[PDB]
A paper describes a structure:
Human APE1 is an essential enzyme and multifunctional nuclease with AP-endonuclease, 3′ phosphodiesterase, 3′ to 5′ exonuclease, and RNA cleavage activities. Instead, rAPs are processed by AP-Endonuclease 1 (APE1), a multifunctional enzyme in the base excision repair (BER) pathway. During BER, abasic (AP) sites are first processed by APE1, which cleaves 5′ of the abasic site generating 3′ hydroxyl and 5′ deoxyribose phosphate termini. Here, we utilize enzyme kinetics, X-ray crystallography, and molecular dynamics simulations to provide insight into rAP processing by APE1.
We obtained crystals of both the substrate form (APE1 bound to an uncleaved rAP site) and product form (APE1 bound to a 5′ nicked rAP site), which diffracted to 2.05 and 2.10 Å, respectively. To generate product complex crystals, we rely on APE1 cleavage of the phosphodiester backbone to create a nick 5′ of the rAP site. Similar to observations of the substrate structures, the rAP DNA backbone (green) is shifted compared to the corresponding structure with deoxy-AP DNA (grey), presumably due to the restrained sugar pucker of the rAP site. However, in the case of the product structure, there is also an accompanying 2.8 Å shift of the 5′ phosphate into the metal binding pocket. This reveals that the rAP is in the position normally occupied by a Mg2+. Interestingly, with the shift of the rAP phosphate backbone relative to the active site residues, these interactions are broken in the rAP product structure. Instead, the phosphate group oxygens are in position to interact with the residues that compose the metal binding pocket (E96, D70, D308) (green). Importantly, with the phosphate in this pocket, it cannot simultaneously contain the catalytic metal, therefore there is no metal bound in this structure. Therefore, in APE1 product structures, this pocket is often occupied by Mg2+, suggesting that here the rAP is actually displacing the Mg2+ out or preventing it from efficiently binding to the metal binding pocket. This highlights the conflict between the rAP and binding of the catalytic metal.
Numbering used by the authors: 43 to 125, 127 to 318
The structure:
């Protein structure tokens, strides 16, 4: 039932040393995560790029302790216009060539869920996909968002190879959560949401970085409900992903689940690429 993430492979199949380390983390309340020592974890992990989802913190209440990461000094933030209910961030060692926010339909919406950062040799998207909600009350919104997102990403990755990370709010296959059969009618594992993720991989196309390396590893999760003691009993879901263009698979050194790192009801994930 438990899971121990394999050790970090810092060399590509071709044999190159990893040159870029990206960490993605749903902090589920940036300010509380900061009080639970999340920045201490990040400083130890020392990623070149850090992506954060569900910040639930407006741009103006951002603790200046984030300024205390000069190793990740270029910081971009995407807060909603309506809501602390969502929000995402991207911090990198080097300035991206260009940073954008949203997926094009910010008229009447602007939910604060996506940052697009263009780097020298690839484009990174971080996303906090809308949860379909308890009793699927937001599933219809989720399906329309999936469609727009796929379309938006299609007209993005035809220029440079793409990395996409974040809380995608779906367990793709039954090997991606602990209770598949009790959850087929729950947000994260409906047939429609599993279909959208399949369509995402097909249409862009993207490869699931973790499952590309560990197709047969079970019990690998990145989210556990705070309730019961689901984290302790590894009753989890894998909702957080690094998705890669096929162009990038020969650079893929490893894709980590940082199961032990506390501070949220998700744990960090870490990507190594040899670029």
């Amino acid at each position: 039932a438990l899971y121990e993430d394999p050790p970090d492979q810092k060399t590509s199949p071709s044999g190159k040393p990893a040159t870029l380390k990206i960490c993605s983390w749903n902090v589920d309340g940036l300010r509380a995560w900061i009080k639970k020592k999340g920045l201490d974890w990040v400083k130890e992990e020392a990623p070149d790029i850090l992506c954060l989802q569900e910040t639930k913190c407006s741009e103006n209440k951002l603790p200046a302790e984030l300024q205390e990461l000069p190793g990740l000094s270029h910081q971009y933030w995407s807060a909603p216009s309506d809501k602390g209910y969502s929000g995402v961030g991207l911090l990198s060692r080097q300035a991206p060539l260009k940073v954008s926010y949203g997926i094009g339909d910010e008229e009447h919406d602007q939910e604060g869920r996506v940052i697009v950062a263009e780097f020298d040799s690839f484009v990174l998207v971080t996303a906090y996909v809308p949860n379909a909600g308890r009793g699927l009350v937001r599933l219809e919104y989720r399906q329309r968002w999936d469609e727009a997102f796929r379309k938006f990403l299609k007209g993005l990755a035809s220029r440079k190879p793409l990395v996409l990370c974040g809380d995608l709010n779906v367990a793709h296959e039954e090997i991606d959560l602990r209770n598949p059969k009790g959850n087929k009618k729950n947000a994260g594992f409906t047939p429609q949401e599993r279909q959208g993720f399949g369509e995402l991989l097909q249409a862009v196309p993207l490869a699931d970085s973790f499952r590309h390396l560990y197709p047969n590893t079970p019990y690998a999760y990145t989210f556990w409900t705070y309730m019961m003691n689901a984290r302790s009993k590894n009753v989890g879901w894998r909702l957080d992903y690094f998705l890669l263009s096929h162009s990038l698979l020969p650079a893929l050194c490893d894709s980590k689940i940082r199961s032990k790192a506390l501070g949220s009801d998700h744990c960090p994930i870490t990507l190594y690429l040899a670029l």
